[PDB]
Design a protein around this ligand. Structure first.
Ligand SMILES: *[C@@]1(O[C@@H]2[C@@H](O)[C@H](O)O[C@H](CO)[C@H]2O)O[C@H](CO)[C@@H](O[C@@H]2O[C@H](CO)[C@@H](O[C@@H]3O[C@H](CO)[C@@H](O)[C@H](O)[C@H]3O)[C@H](O)[C@H]2O)[C@H](O)[C@H]1O
Ligand SMILES: [Ca+2]
Ligand SMILES: [Ca+2]
Length: 175
């Protein structure tokens, strides 16, 4: 495993995040003040059968050396659950692959959320047509990360410092 961290998005550079929604649900994103420097504010309106998310399609899909993913989050509002999702790459050259999720509820102060990869759960409400149906998160085959709906409610939150986390230090190995 790698030691240290690897920044995926500190929100100080290119705008990496695309928005999608349907069935009456909506999301919009913008750059705002973050935890350090700038961050991305996500404003969403849920609906009963609708969906929304914001997505970063990653240029490097091999996360096998790392242990956790971390980000800072804060609500801007009534507390409301969302999901952070990792999608594998598709088995058929189009769309995405297997969806893996973890639920988070932004609150009124900045919090760093570190999620071990082994804590992600296989998404139960939906899988895309190009999923591998492996029931294991394949860290050498990552397509994208998302902040997306959990429910039919509305809210506003800000994220910053999306990064991979490895081992804490290089330590001496026993023989
Ligand atoms: C979206 O596509 C992204 C693409 O725009 C971008 O170019 O590349 C990235 C990275 O590869 C893509 O992520 O991908 C998301 C995640 O797979 C799609 O979201 C799913 O959309 C389906 C509908 O197409 C939706 O299913 C509906 O869910 C509702 C609510 O539960 C249900 O009532 C409906 O019956 C379902 O059809 C899933 O919930 C979403 O995750 C998005 O559509 C793409 O644009
Ligand atoms: Ca920042
Ligand atoms: Ca898989």
């Amino acid at each position: 495993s790698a030691v240290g961290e690897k920044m995926l998005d500190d929100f100080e550079g290119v705008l990496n995040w695309g928005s999608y929604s349907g069935e009456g649900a909506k999301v919009s994103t913008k750059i705002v003040s973050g935890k350090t420097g700038n961050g991305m504010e996500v404003s969403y309106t849920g609906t009963t059968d609708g969906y929304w998310g914001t997505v970063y399609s990653l240029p490097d899909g091999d996360w096998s050396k790392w242990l956790k993913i971390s980000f800072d989050i804060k609500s801007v509002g009534s507390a409301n659950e969302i999901r952070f999702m990792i999608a594998e790459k598709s088995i058929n050259g189009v769309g995405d692959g297997e969806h893996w999720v973890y639920s988070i509820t932004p609150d009124s102060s900045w919090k760093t959320i570190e999620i071990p990869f082994s804590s992600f759960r296989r998404r139960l409400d939906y899988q895309p047509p190009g999923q591998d149906m492996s029931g294991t998160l394949d860290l050498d085959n990552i397509d994208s990360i998302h902040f997306m709906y959990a429910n039919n409610k509305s809210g506003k939150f800000v994220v910053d410092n999306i990064k991979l986390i490895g081992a804490l230090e290089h330590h001496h190995h026993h023989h």
